[PDB]
Design a protein around this ligand. Sequence first.
Ligand SMILES: C[C@H](C[C@H](C[C@@H](CCC(=O)O)C(=O)O)C(=O)O)C(=O)O
Ligand SMILES: [Mg+2]
Length: 535
Amino acid sequence: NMMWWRGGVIYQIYPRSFLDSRGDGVGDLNGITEKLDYVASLNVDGIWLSPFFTSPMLDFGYDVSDYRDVDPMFGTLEDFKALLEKAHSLGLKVMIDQVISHTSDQHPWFQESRQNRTNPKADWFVWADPKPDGTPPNNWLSIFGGSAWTFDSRRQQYYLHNFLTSQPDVNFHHPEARQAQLDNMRFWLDLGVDGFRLDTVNFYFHDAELRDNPPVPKGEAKTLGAPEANPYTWQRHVYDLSRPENLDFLKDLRALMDEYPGTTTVGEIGDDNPLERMAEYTAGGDKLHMAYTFDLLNMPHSASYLREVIERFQRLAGDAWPCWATSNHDVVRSATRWGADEDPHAYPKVMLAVLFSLRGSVCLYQGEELGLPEADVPFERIQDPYGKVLWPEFKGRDGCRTPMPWTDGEQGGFSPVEPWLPMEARHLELAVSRQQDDPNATLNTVRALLAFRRSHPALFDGDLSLVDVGDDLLGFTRQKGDETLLCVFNLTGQEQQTTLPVEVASDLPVAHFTATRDGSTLTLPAYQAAFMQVA
Ligand SMILES: C[C@H](C[C@H](C[C@@H](CCC(=O)O)C(=O)O)C(=O)O)C(=O)O
Ligand SMILES: [Mg+2]
């Protein structure tokens, strides 16, 4: 089963906010180990851990100061080996973040690099002289605010950072820096991890000529990877990322992965044309195994929008392989972002049915299986630096990073002390303990859906074909071998009805969904899904 990743369902864990087992208010590895039984009980195939490596935590793990160790705050390397082994014993794959596009400015490489222009690591990062007036070398902007260039008096030069000033970008034009990052990944492969989520995977290379980006012409759509209030959205991102050289490197990265049969990679795409980039990066069988985009992580969510996404993707490279996600640690929780104006109990159910029925792998975010709404974090409790630069038009990412509600008791059973972000009051009645034995709760709908999906080869990696089912329903068939299934979804809060475009052999009952099939007319009550075996 060395192709489990190609259609597999991955559960994303944000270690800080999963379970505190030690009592400091921050989630740790041992807490995860303690909850792997729950995770396995979701019927997912594995997990992806957000960064737990040595880090100042200025971007909460994504500023790495030691690639081959666990930060004391999360536990130890031994804790991780225990987690990994227990996870394997439960049949779970374990993937971890790898953040190789940039290091913390506390990383020894950068400490060395910044001292002068001639040291051995001077070119391991991206340095450039000021313009004659002393200003940044070009017009590139940090996603987290201000210029992508920061002046350093030691070298009398600017260094590049797409993200925080404390996250200097690695210069992939330097083959030794590239190889060093491969070696860092190899370290975790040798411990037996099953794969990597590759942070900002298309950011690796920048244009060495340092060309200015062009502006976005007035009225044109902005990138899906950033809020519209961010001036980063005012330029087309052509030279600051997604360079051709990255393809060669992705091959190298893939070669590394191939030395460890059965391992996989999911790349994070942040690009002006993300579907295209994802097809580009996952094609050929010699680069990334899969990647996800922000196409399903934004505001549009109608059945017609989903149709547009599917069509667009279907026109791309036939050998590409997408990983789909409706939530992660960077966006408003789906039940709010997509379902704010929908029934809070029924909408997440059908939305997840769609997610689990699309052709691709799936990433499912911690708490999404509980139908958790976005949390409201008060100003004085804000932690994410990305929540302190565009406030209040954009309030950062803490709203999706609040601690996991295990019980309806104090701190949701997450911690014995006040946690690093406040437990959301609305989450308590949606806690795991409250939801565990309720067959009508979103948790059990998810368990049921993933068991169902697991029982049908066509829902693993079958082809997908859109079918006419009217304007307000989403419909397609999934096909593999003997099996062709018809999948129809009502994402609206009103009854909808359609003529079946194919001929139904039988109904497939799943997770208490209710739909009326009368001859050739299919009726779906609000927020219902319907699966049918096709003749
Ligand atoms: C280093 C890490 C970057 C990526 C990607 C980033 C890129 C923005 C984009 O989607 O274009 C983000 O805001 O999500 C991540 O968050 O997972 C971070 O921003 O904290
Ligand atoms: Mg802890």
